[PDB]
Design an enzyme around this catalytic site. Structure first.
Site, PDB file in Angstrom:
ATOM      1  N   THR A  81       0.839  -1.192   0.000  1.00  0.00           N
ATOM      2  CA  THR A  81       0.000   0.000   0.000  1.00  0.00           C
ATOM      3  C   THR A  81       0.875   1.242   0.000  1.00  0.00           C
ATOM      4  OG1 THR A  81      -1.884  -1.019   1.113  1.00  0.00           O
ATOM      5  CG2 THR A  81      -1.660   1.367   1.349  1.00  0.00           C
ATOM      6  N   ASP A 122      -2.990   4.143  -3.690  1.00  0.00           N
ATOM      7  CA  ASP A 122      -3.007   3.151  -4.727  1.00  0.00           C
ATOM      8  C   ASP A 122      -4.237   2.247  -4.524  1.00  0.00           C
ATOM      9  OD1 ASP A 122      -1.852   1.607  -2.485  1.00  0.00           O
ATOM     10  OD2 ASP A 122      -1.468   0.050  -4.013  1.00  0.00           O
ATOM     11  N   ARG A 158      -4.002  -1.575  -4.950  1.00  0.00           N
ATOM     12  CA  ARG A 158      -3.672  -2.983  -4.756  1.00  0.00           C
ATOM     13  C   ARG A 158      -3.909  -3.461  -3.314  1.00  0.00           C
ATOM     14  NH1 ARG A 158       2.121  -5.334  -6.890  1.00  0.00           N
ATOM     15  NH2 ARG A 158       0.982  -4.917  -8.839  1.00  0.00           N
ATOM     16  N   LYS A 180      -9.069   2.690  -0.865  1.00  0.00           N
ATOM     17  CA  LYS A 180      -8.379   2.910   0.396  1.00  0.00           C
ATOM     18  C   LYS A 180      -8.634   4.261   1.027  1.00  0.00           C
ATOM     19  CE  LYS A 180      -4.776  -0.100  -1.329  1.00  0.00           C
ATOM     20  NZ  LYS A 180      -3.335  -0.386  -1.358  1.00  0.00           N
ATOM     21  N   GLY A 236      -2.230  -1.037   6.496  1.00  0.00           N
ATOM     22  CA  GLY A 236      -2.090  -1.972   7.603  1.00  0.00           C
ATOM     23  C   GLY A 236      -3.092  -3.078   7.391  1.00  0.00           C
ATOM     24  N   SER A 296       3.594   0.167   2.917  1.00  0.00           N
ATOM     25  CA  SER A 296       4.834  -0.399   2.411  1.00  0.00           C
ATOM     26  C   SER A 296       5.542   0.484   1.337  1.00  0.00           C
ATOM     27  CB  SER A 296       4.598  -1.819   1.874  1.00  0.00           C
ATOM     28  OG  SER A 296       3.617  -1.854   0.877  1.00  0.00           O
ATOM     29  N   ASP A 331       7.400  -0.385  -5.039  1.00  0.00           N
ATOM     30  CA  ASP A 331       6.980  -1.257  -3.935  1.00  0.00           C
ATOM     31  C   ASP A 331       6.138  -2.384  -4.502  1.00  0.00           C
ATOM     32  OD1 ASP A 331       6.146  -2.344  -1.384  1.00  0.00           O
ATOM     33  OD2 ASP A 331       4.430  -0.986  -1.384  1.00  0.00           O
ATOM     34  N   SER A 355       2.432  -2.379  -3.658  1.00  0.00           N
ATOM     35  CA  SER A 355       1.583  -1.323  -4.207  1.00  0.00           C
ATOM     36  C   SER A 355       1.411  -1.482  -5.704  1.00  0.00           C
ATOM     37  CB  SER A 355       2.134   0.057  -3.907  1.00  0.00           C
ATOM     38  OG  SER A 355       2.278   0.275  -2.528  1.00  0.00           O
TER      39      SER A 355
HETATM   40 CL   LIG Z   1       0.960  -1.526   3.808  1.00  0.00          CL
END
Ligand SMILES: [Cl-]
Ligand SMILES: [Cl-]
Ligand SMILES: [Cl-]
Ligand SMILES: [Cl-]
Ligand SMILES: [Cl-]
Ligand SMILES: [Cl-]
Ligand SMILES: [Cl-]
Ligand SMILES: [Cl-]
Ligand SMILES: [Cl-]
Ligand SMILES: [Cl-]
Ligand SMILES: [Cl-]
Ligand SMILES: [Cl-]
Ligand SMILES: [Cl-]
Ligand SMILES: [Cl-]
Ligand SMILES: [Cl-]
Ligand SMILES: [Cl-]
Ligand SMILES: [Cl-]
Ligand SMILES: [K+]
Ligand SMILES: [K+]
Ligand SMILES: [Mg+2]
Ligand SMILES: [Mg+2]
Ligand SMILES: [Mg+2]
Ligand SMILES: [Mg+2]
Lengths: 238, 220, 235, 196, 230, 204, 247, 240, 203
Positions: free
Chosen positions: B1, B17, B19, B33, B47, B129, B166, B169
């Site tokens: 994320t 994002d 994903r 999100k 999280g 992340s 990442d 993501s």
């Molecule tokens: Cl995350």
């Protein structure tokens, strides 16, 4: 003017009285008389015991609380046992925590606090018992009196129960002598005061007298039956 | 994320994002999100997904009860307090990492909220992340008092950095723009990623699958 | 109906045959037992509270005789009615405001504080085992959007915001005086003086204020009160 | 390790269980019975951890009997299996889980014979035949090889025997005798122990 | 603490007199009216507002529960606030679980069940309020009443509080199905005018409406406009 | 892994005015198959089904506790539940056990009871919902299922093409998983009927 | 506290429970509610008290409540109390299904609710619930069934009965016309109307003033339906035709 | 009344008679007085001796509730002792939680709210006592508060409670206590107790005296025996 | 983190760095670690950010209510006692190292340390946080009885600058506050305003 105010310990009367407390005190006034007095060195309790019939044993009036404290009771027996068990427990807790005897005036404060609680809550009732408390500690001998009102009194001497006014009159008459009395003299005074509560025809006997003594060199000890004989002779005939 | 937010001249821009992964497999290519808190307050979440969903839902609901009672528009500080006191009580066991932004009677406000219950009030923040990739963009390019379009650009550049660098993501960039005068919930804002075009044609005929038993149950 | 009664409807908070709650009505009479009246007025710039300060004794420490209370730095209050009940309700208000700020991160609005106290009072009108409190609370504060506020709640759990209001013995006469006018500090003190027929010394009233310039609740000193009494006296 | 087996024919369910109670390296009883009568047409066969097995099975038994007294008729095998499952599942994450593996065998007037398998996790499966214990590893394939749905009871007892003979030949544990019972429309019948 | 015995009980003739007496509190309350139109609902009520001194905007009788449900009452104001707070809480509890706004009828059932509790639970009296609840869901308007007993009723139109018997007969003469919201507002205000006394203004009545867009109070200026024509 | 103790696989897939839901049939304990007709998909309405993979005990418990809640809902509301609302009810049920979860990850497939619009979703074991417009998968062979679904799924499939696609996706995915299979069951949900089929399948 | 307590759960000097008896008087004034059992089904027929006005008609019935797949009930008495009890019935039924994975047998559901009613008469110091219920159902043990319960927590099974207004007169008519072992749903329905026609002393019986629900079995499934107004007008018409032929 | 049996019941005139009756218990008790002066607070109590059998010191009506706080009581003495225990607990809890000695005003307000809680409910009765709290510190000066059975709490220059309260207040009013020291004021306290004592109705009393002030370094203490005796001699000779 | 406070005649000076780390990622480089608890009472926070924010918010609530009840400004020692009570009682569940500093009319400028574990001690000056280790020597050598406000601000800024150079877990800007009967004066030292001491590069 009385009936709506007399059933609940939470109902003040228009005169600022609580009739349930006054009625609980009648339980003590109808108990058999007991006397407590002290010298500089000893505290003594003396009690008349009632036997319901000729074949019953006389009811115990004097109870051990701790090595340094005993009590004489007047009023409801079961309340007396409950309060005695409370006192016993407070004494044990003090020795457990501090490894020393609970001072007598502190124990009496605890009784006051415990016995006040039900006088203020709906559906509870006062304790229907009065106590005379004989003790010895660092401040010397003590006689305290406790009441169904939860009030308590520090006494030179005292009598509670039926016809105890007579005993109180004797005690006031002789109290200037008590401090300097030897133990024998002091117990005799107790017995003379108690004898004043009797109908003219009745006497103190080994069957109806109970004695409790504590002092400087004497743990609280109860004397009944044959053991009261030394104290009864004694004693100027009425 | 990757989730992020900035304070610009007239408001807040949030970004995310789309994903969601389970282990190292993409489960959702178009996860949302950016959560509603109130008409003037939104919250990006990273999280543990159930925890961010349920936590934002609960605080949104309690805030609605609050505003119904007060008759006033809610404050960002109130959402912050409610979230942080709850997360603290749970001692990090609710795994919600949040970027909370809105506009109230005292203007624009942006907070990062961590699972243990710490919050920071800041002009730009990132979480997830991809958060370092997004933060690098912000450190390099953020200026105070940006105009709306510049701020939108900056946030999408930050989300893109997470998307491409990442493994956690991916997929689209969503934005939410909040000012005194408007709310633009832009889902998707940009679609930098697309599945490649299919080359081999399968088209399996009827009867390709052998059947052992059948029952038709007619309805209504 | 017309004053009817059945069973225990004069003793506890159950409905009378007309749908009245006599115990609540009696709680309003309790407010007057103290023999005092309070007045509150709002304008564009400020909100003011004034009440009588009776110190018949003099063996009293008069600085402890007050019906004005700070709830938060920015919310003041005047209490009217039974004193111990009043002090209890002030304590509850203080708790509610402090808890609000802790949970929500901003000061409780005056209307919300008044409502909360009113909702707490409502419970006592519906549950039989306790009485209503025989007091009335008037709150003042500055709202950032709406300006000065004066709110009152009562033993029935009613509450409202007012342009001006009163409580206690001369509530109805104060209400007539203020109605006639409404169709700030000088209005409050004149209303109270008129309905009591007194003409005050500065030690016979208390005054508290909040202003848009200075939102903190402030209690006027005697000298400050006297500057108002003298300015009025010279009509 | 304890062994349970059940085989459901058209109109009956045949069950058997070993008769050993073991502790450490010794058999402490050789005529142990692992079957609990729940009602006229239901047997519960229970193995697992000591204490848990009897406590659980007897709790179920009493409650099944209580249902009968309260209501004037018995729980069906299916209803009894689900009651059993509910209790085991409800305990699974409690302070008092029961480590027990079960078969429930029954006959219902209207539905015929039923055999249910349950593990300690409380997964419940209806099956035409089933077994519990390490012995199941050696016997299930014999059942798969020879069973049919119309298997007569006189053949079913032979099939059961082949399974038990396989345990004597190949299983490392000494299980010399087995309780055998059959349930049908006429209730629960004791058959001869199968012994070696 | 708490008394644990019911304060509402059966009389020898089978009546729950505390509930009847709660209904007498409602009957003496200020009038309220509800009308379900073809495309919405209106709720209207009179302010028992003496004094110029009141800030009429400071407390509202017509209150939102959710975006799509609102309420008014007749009877005891403070009791009403209890029910408003509970209704709001019930609606949010539903939304947390189902993630869909609570259907009007579901909200009414839950609020009515609370009112029932106060006719039986220990040491309390019933609420001295009847509620009128409006909402819009499944593409359709709803109007309900919930009374002190916990009984609830779906209405096309009704009145409660003072002079309600005559308000209902006034509405019976005047209501028809296919009627629109704007016309219904007008007739709701005319129904209040039947028992008003002392000249209507946009400050001494409150009006709320419910349609596909949601529930909201009418503004003073909107009410002033409708009051031209009356 | 707790989630692999019993094995198993479920999937749902969206078509043109239809949905499909499928499951393997194995009930096994680690390596041992116990039965081959274990129910994993449960009706929650005439046109609304839930499939549960994971620990067999919890598959059953969740299905039963969910049915308890749904029955009460339908009696109180006087209507059939909407697909999105069932998703929310399931999410709430799973999240109540946030700190000692049920070990099951459901998929839901259905048509709206009034509008007949297709719906599919899945949830993780603590109730995080994911709605998609294509397919959802859950079980011990999720990767295998993703591979098949990504390659075969197309938008707007008719019921016959949807059936072949979900069937081929299941059969070939479970044939690469030791602890899923022993048969595949498929339900095709349409406005006017439900079609239930078992597939010819490997039994190893 | 002792002063204000009604003492709802004590005996009177003749061994009576006065709150239960007084609740029974409330029920006697509520809408007439009857139940009839036939060979191929069971029915409930109730007088509506939402007797019309500007009332809006939003639910499928006023006083008929579905309890689970196989059971329904009707009520006479305090409506809000009935709502509490019918909710509890639904819960009890679902608890039983959860536990056993089969539907609760009819008599067990009735008994379970009656234990709650009984408890309200014996402890807690609360007023009892002012409700009597008629329950209709099918189960696999006893097939089609009709129960009655009242505020004492007593219940019984009936072939036909009546609660609410004029119940005594209704039961007389049932005793004389009901054919034990020989009633169909068609004839039970005809009887239901005959009885409501005589016991509704509020004017010439009309479809808007009654509700009828039937419970039948079709293809191994229970079917519970509330008759539409068209069908009820037809039954009233057939009754009025039959009273004319009676001459 | 009908209306006078519960503290949860208002009378039609808005009175809580159970509280008024509790006040009558206080008004039947012998008199206690407190006087605040320049450098402290002095308490005195007319302590009726109901029997010569009691020890001189029995049924003290003066209590230490914190090292810096004294309490003087009138009314039902078991209720008063209970309140002294509540006061002590409040003072102790305050020191543990906040880390300094409880300010007298705050102690008074906290114990008054406890007393007040017993005036709302049928479940309990009002306390049948009134009490004064007195303290002194360099920072706060002398402070004297009085709390009654309703829970009202005010600060005083001088105060009296019990049966001769009015007569006592009229004598206290004659003193310019603001300018007098504790050592002066003890005498005055003794004098006033002797004036209001009804020696015809109730012979025999003990004077109980305590003080807290600069001279005790802010500690509440009994008045030393020699000073009490000189105060009694002054009071007796002033009476003639 | 590095935190510090120092007494002068009439008030106190407080200071902190501004770095919040998760591992060795800087999650906030402009943290405000000086938190107002009342008008003239602040705390300096080190340890877990969640814990110190939660405790500071709770004490602010407790002290605010206390102050309204008493109708007086709160004592610095009361603020410190409230922190101590909470930090001691919950010592097994908190990682909090606090300095409480402020002014009140009774005792003037005061500094209290409430380190991890929840003891409380008044000090002339206090330091804490991870970076405090590196400046014990410096503060011990540099401290002088009788420092003015302007000298105490210099001392604090110098100490914090030294700690920030050496401690990976400290850095960013220096936030300073001076508290006195007149009020609270806050400032930030950033970039070239932060005292500089050469790296000892080779001759
Ligand atoms: Cl995350
Ligand atoms: Cl005795
Ligand atoms: Cl006795
Ligand atoms: Cl006494
Ligand atoms: Cl006596
Ligand atoms: Cl905050
Ligand atoms: Cl705060
Ligand atoms: Cl009770
Ligand atoms: Cl609300
Ligand atoms: Cl609105
Ligand atoms: Cl559940
Ligand atoms: Cl649910
Ligand atoms: Cl069902
Ligand atoms: Cl930094
Ligand atoms: Cl530390
Ligand atoms: Cl530290
Ligand atoms: Cl640190
Ligand atoms: K009440
Ligand atoms: K550094
Ligand atoms: Mg922690
Ligand atoms: Mg175990
Ligand atoms: Mg496979
Ligand atoms: Mg294989």
């Amino acid at each position: 003017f009385r009936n709506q105010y007399d059933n609940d310990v939470t109902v003040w009367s228009p005169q600022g009285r609580i009739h349930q407390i006054e009625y609980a005190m009648e339980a003590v006034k109808q108990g058999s008389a007991t006397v407590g007095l002290k010298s500089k060195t000893h505290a003594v309790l003396v009690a008349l015991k009632r036997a319901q019939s000729e074949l019953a044993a006389h009811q115990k009036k004097i109870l051990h609380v701790d090595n340094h404290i005993g009590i004489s009771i007047a009023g409801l027996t079961a309340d007396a046992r409950l309060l005695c068990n409370f006192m016993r427990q407070e004494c044990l807790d003090s020795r457990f925590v501090f490894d020393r005897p609970l001072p007598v005036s502190r124990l009496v404060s605890l009784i006051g606090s415990k016995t006040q609680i039900p006088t203020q809550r709906y559906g509870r009732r006062p304790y229907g018992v009065g106590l005379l408390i004989a003790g010895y500690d660092d401040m010397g001998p003590h006689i305290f009196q406790t009441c169904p009102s939860a009030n308590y009194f520090d006494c030179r001497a005292m009598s509670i129960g039926a016809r105890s006014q007579s005993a109180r009159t004797y005690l006031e008459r002789h109290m200037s002598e008590f401090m300097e009395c030897n133990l024998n003299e002091l117990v005799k005074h107790g017995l003379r005061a108690l004898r004043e509560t009797l109908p003219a025809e009745q006497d103190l006997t080994t069957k109806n007298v109970s004695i409790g003594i504590v002092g400087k060199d004497l743990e609280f000890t109860i004397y009944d039956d044959d053991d009261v004989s030394p104290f009864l002779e004694g004693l100027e005939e009425r | 994320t990757t989730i992020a937010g900035v304070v610009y001249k007239d408001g807040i821009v949030l970004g995310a994002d789309t994903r969601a992964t389970e282990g190292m497999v993409v489960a959702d290519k178009n996860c949302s999100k950016i959560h509603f808190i109130s008409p003037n307050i939104y919250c990006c979440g990273a999280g543990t997904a159930a925890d961010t969903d349920m936590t934002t839902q609960l605080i949104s609901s309690n805030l609605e009860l609050h505003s119904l009672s007060t008759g006033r528009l809610p404050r960002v500080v109130t959402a912050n307090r409610m979230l942080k006191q709850m997360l603290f009580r749970y001692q990090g066991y609710i795994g919600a990492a949040l970027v909370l932004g809105g506009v109230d009677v005292t203007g624009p406000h942006l907070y990062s909220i961590y699972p243990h219950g710490s919050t920071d009030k800041l002009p730009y923040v990132t979480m997830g992340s991809g958060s370092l990739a997004a933060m690098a963009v912000f450190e390099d390019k953020f200026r105070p008092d940006m105009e709306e379009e510049e701020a939108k650009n900056l946030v999408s550049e930050a989300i893109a950095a997470g998307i491409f660098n990442d493994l956690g993501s991916g997929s689209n960039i969503d934005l939410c723009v909040i000012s005194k005068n408007k709310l633009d919930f832009l889902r998707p804002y940009t679609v930098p990623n697309k599945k490649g075009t299919r080359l081999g044609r399968y088209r399996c005929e009827k009867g390709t699958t052998a059947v052992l038993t059948e029952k038709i149950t007619p309805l209504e | 109906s017309r004053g009817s009664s059945a069973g225990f409807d004069r003793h506890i908070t159950i409905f009378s045959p007309e749908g009245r709650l006599y115990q609540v009505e009696y709680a309003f009479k309790a407010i007057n037992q103290g023999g005092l009246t309070s007045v509150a007025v709002r304008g564009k710039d400020c909100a003011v509270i004034v009440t009588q300060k009776k110190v018949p004794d003099k063996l009293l420490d008069s600085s402890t005789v007050t019906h004005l209370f700070k709830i938060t730095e920015n919310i003041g209050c005047v209490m009217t009615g039974m004193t111990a009940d009043s002090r209890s309700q002030v304590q509850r208000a203080r708790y509610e405001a402090a808890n609000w700020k802790y949970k929500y991160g901003y000061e409780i609005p005056v209307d919300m504080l008044c409502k909360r106290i009113a909702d707490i009072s409502q419970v006592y009108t519906q549950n039989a085992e306790m009485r209503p409190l025989g007091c009335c609370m008037i709150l003042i504060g500055i709202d950032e959007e709406q300006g000065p506020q004066v709110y009152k709640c009562d033993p029935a759990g009613y509450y409202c915001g007012f342009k001006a209001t009163a409580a206690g013995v001369k509530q109805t006469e104060s209400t007539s005086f203020l109605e006639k006018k409404v169709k700030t500090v000088e209005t409050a003190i004149t209303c109270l003086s008129t309905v009591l027929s007194i003409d005050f010394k500065p030690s016979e009233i208390e005054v508290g204020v909040v202003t848009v310039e200075n939102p903190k609740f402030r209690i006027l000193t005697e000298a400050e009160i006297d500057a108002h009494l003298v300015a009025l006296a010279e009509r | 390790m304890e062994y349970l087996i059940g085989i459901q024919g058209p109109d009956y369910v045949l069950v058997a269980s070993d008769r050993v109670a073991a502790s450490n390296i010794v058999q402490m009883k050789d005529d142990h019975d692992k079957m609990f009568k729940m009602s006229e047409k239901i047997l519960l066969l229970c193995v697992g951890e000591a204490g848990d097995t009897v406590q659980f099975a007897e709790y179920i038994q009493k409650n099944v009997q209580l249902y009968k007294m309260r209501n004037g008729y018995e729980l069906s095998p299916t209803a009894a299996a689900n009651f059993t499952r509910r209790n085991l599942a409800d305990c699974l994450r409690s302070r008092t889980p029961y480590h027990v593996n079960l078969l429930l065998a029954g006959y219902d007037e209207h539905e015929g014979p039923a055999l249910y398998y349950m593990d300690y996790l409380a997964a419940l499966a209806k099956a035409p035949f089933a077994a519990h214990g390490y012995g199941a590893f050696l016997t299930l394939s014999i059942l798969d090889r020879y069973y049919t749905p119309t298997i007569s009871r006189e053949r079913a007892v032979e099939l059961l025997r082949k399974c038990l003979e396989e345990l004597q030949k190949r299983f490392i544990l000494n299980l010399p005798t087995f309780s055998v019972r059959i349930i049908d429309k006429n209730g629960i019948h004791d058959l001869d122990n199968i012994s070696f | 603490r708490g008394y644990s015995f019911s304060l509402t009980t059966f009389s020898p003739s089978g009546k729950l007199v505390q509930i009847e007496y709660a209904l007498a509190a409602v009957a003496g309350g200020a009038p309220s009216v509800g009308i379900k139109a073809a495309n919405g609902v209106v709720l209207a009520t009179e302010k028992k507002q003496k004094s110029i001194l009141y800030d009429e905007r400071s407390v509202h009788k017509v209150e939102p529960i959710t975006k799509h449900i609102g309420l008014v009452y007749s009877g005891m104001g403070p009791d009403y606030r209890v029910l408003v707070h509970r209704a709001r809480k019930l609606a949010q509890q539903y939304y947390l679980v189902y993630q869909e706004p609570i259907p009007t009828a579901q909200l009414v059932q839950r609020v009515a069940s609370v009112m029932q509790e106060y006719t039986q639970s220990g040491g309390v009296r019933p609420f001295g309020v009847s509620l009128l609840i409006c909402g819009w869901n499944e593409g359709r308007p709803y109007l309900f009443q919930s009374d002190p007993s916990g009984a609830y009723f779906a209405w096309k139109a009704t009145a409660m509080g003072k002079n309600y018997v005559n308000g209902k007969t006034f509405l019976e003469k005047r209501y028809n199905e296919d009627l629109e919201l704007e016309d219904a507002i007008h007739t709701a205000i005319l129904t209040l005018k039947e028992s008003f006394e002392g000249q209507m203004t946009e400050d001494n009545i409150e009006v709320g409406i419910c349609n596909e867009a949601g529930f909201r109070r009418l503004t003073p200026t909107e009410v002033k406009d409708y009051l031209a024509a009356i | 892994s707790i989630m692999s103790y019993n094995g198993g696989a479920v999937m749902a897939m969206k078509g043109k005015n239809c949905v499909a839901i499928a499951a393997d049939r194995r009930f096994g304990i680690q390596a041992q198959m116990v039965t081959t007709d274990f129910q994993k998909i449960f009706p929650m309405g005439d046109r609304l089904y839930i499939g549960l993979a994971g620990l067999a005990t919890d598959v059953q418990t969740v299905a039963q506790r969910l049915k308890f809640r749904l029955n009460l809902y339908e009696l109180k509301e006087g209507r059939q539940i909407k697909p999105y609302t069932l998703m929310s009810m399931v999410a709430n049920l799973l999240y109540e056990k946030r700190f000692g979860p049920y070990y099951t990850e459901p998929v839901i497939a259905g048509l709206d009871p009034k509008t007949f619009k297709p719906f599919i979703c899945s949830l993780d074991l603590i109730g995080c919902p994911m709605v998609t417009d294509d397919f959802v998968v859950s079980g011990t062979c999720a990767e295998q299922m993703y591979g098949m679904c990504e390659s075969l799924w197309e938008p707007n499939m008719d019921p016959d093409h949807l059936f072949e696609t979900i069937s081929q996706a299941m059969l070939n995915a479970v044939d690469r998983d030791a602890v899923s299979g022993m048969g595949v069951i498929v339900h095709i949900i349409e406005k006017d009927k439900i079609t239930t089929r078992t597939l010819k399948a490997r039994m190893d | 506290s002792r002063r204000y307590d009604s003492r709802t759960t004590i005996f009177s000097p003749e061994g009576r429970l006065y709150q239960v008896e007084y609740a029974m008087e409330a029920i006697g004034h509520a809408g007439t509610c009857l139940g009839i059992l036939a060979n191929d089904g069971v029915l409930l027929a109730a007088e509506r008290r939402n007797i019309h006005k500007l009332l809006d008609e939003v639910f499928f019935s006023e006083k008929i409540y579905k309890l689970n797949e196989d059971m329904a009930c009707s009520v006479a008495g305090i409506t809000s109390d009935a709502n509490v009890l019918t909710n509890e019935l639904r819960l009890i039924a679902q608890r039983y299904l959860l536990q056993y994975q089969e539907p609760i047998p009819c008599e067990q559901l009735v008994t379970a609710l009656c234990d709650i009613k009984q408890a309200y008469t014996q402890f807690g110091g609360k007023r009892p619930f002012g409700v009597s219920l008629l329950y209709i159902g099918w189960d696999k043990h006893y097939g089609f069934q009709l129960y009655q319960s009242d505020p004492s927590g007593n219940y019984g099974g009936w072939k036909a009965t009546c609660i609410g207004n004029n119940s005594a007169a209704a039961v007389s008519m049932l005793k004389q016309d009901y054919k034990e072992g020989e009633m169909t749903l068609k004839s039970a329905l005809a009887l239901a109307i005959k009885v409501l026609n005589k016991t509704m002393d509020v004017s010439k019986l009309s479809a808007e003033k009654v509700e009828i629900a039937t419970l039948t079995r079709e293809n191994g499934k229970t079917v519970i339906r509330v008759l539409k107004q068209k069908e009820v007008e037809q039954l009233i018409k057939k009754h009025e035709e039959e009273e004319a032929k009676a001459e | 009344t009908g209306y006078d049996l519960s503290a949860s019941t208002f009378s039609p005139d808005g009175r809580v008679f159970q509280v008024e009756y509790a006040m009558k218990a206080v008004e039947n008790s012998s008199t206690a007085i407190g006087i605040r002066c320049k450098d402290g607070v002095v308490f005195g109590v007319e302590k009726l001796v109901l029997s010569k059998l009691y020890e001189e010191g029995s049924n003290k009506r003066l209590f230490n509730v914190d090292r810096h706080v004294g309490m003087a009581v009138a009314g039902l003495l078991a209720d008063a002792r209970s309140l002294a225990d509540i006061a002590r607990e409040e003072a102790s809890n305050f020191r543990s939680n906040f880390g300094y000695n409880i300010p007298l005003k705050h102690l008074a307000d906290r114990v008054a709210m406890y007393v007040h809680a017993y005036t709302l409910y049928s479940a309990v009765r009002p306390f049948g006592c009134s009490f004064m709290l007195g303290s002194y510190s360099v920072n706060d000066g002398a402070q004297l508060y009085m709390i009654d059975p309703s829970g009202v709490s005010y600060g005083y220059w001088g105060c009296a409670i019990g049966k001769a309260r009015q007569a006592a207040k009229t004598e206290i009013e004659k003193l310019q206590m603001k300018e007098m020291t504790c050592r002066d004021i003890v005498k005055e306290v003794a004098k006033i107790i002797y004036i209001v004592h009804d020696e015809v109705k109730d012979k025999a009393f003990e004077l109980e005296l305590s003080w807290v002030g600069e001279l005790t370094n802010g500690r509440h203490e009994i008045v030393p025996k020699d000073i009490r005796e000189e105060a009694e001699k002054y009071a007796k000779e002033s009476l003639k | 983190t590095t935190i510090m406070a120092v007494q002068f005649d009439g008030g106190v000076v407080l200071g902190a760095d501004s770095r919040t780390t998760t591992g060795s990622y800087i999650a906030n480089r402009v943290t405000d670690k000086l938190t107002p608890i009342h008008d003239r009472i602040f705390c300096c926070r080190s340890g877990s950010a969640a814990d110190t924010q939660a405790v500071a918010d709770a004490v602010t609530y407790q002290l605010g209510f206390h102050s309204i009840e008493l109708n007086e400004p709160p004592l610095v020692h009361t603020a410190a006692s409230l922190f101590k009570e909470m930090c001691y009682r919950y010592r097994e569940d908190l990682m909090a190292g606090i300095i409480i500093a402020g002014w009140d009319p009774q005792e003037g400028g005061q500094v209290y340390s409430v380190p991890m574990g929840g003891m409380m001690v008044r000090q002339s000056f206090a330091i804490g946080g991870s970076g405090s280790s590196y400046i014990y020597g410096y503060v011990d050598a540099t401290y002088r009885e009788g420092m003015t406000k302007e000298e105490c601000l210099q001392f604090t800024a110098n100490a914090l600058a030294l700690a920030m150079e050496r401690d990976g877990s400290s850095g960013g800007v220096i936030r300073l506050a001076a508290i006195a009967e007149s009020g609270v004066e806050r400032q930030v030292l950033l970039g070239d305003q932060i005292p500089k001491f050469a790296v000892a590069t080779l001759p």
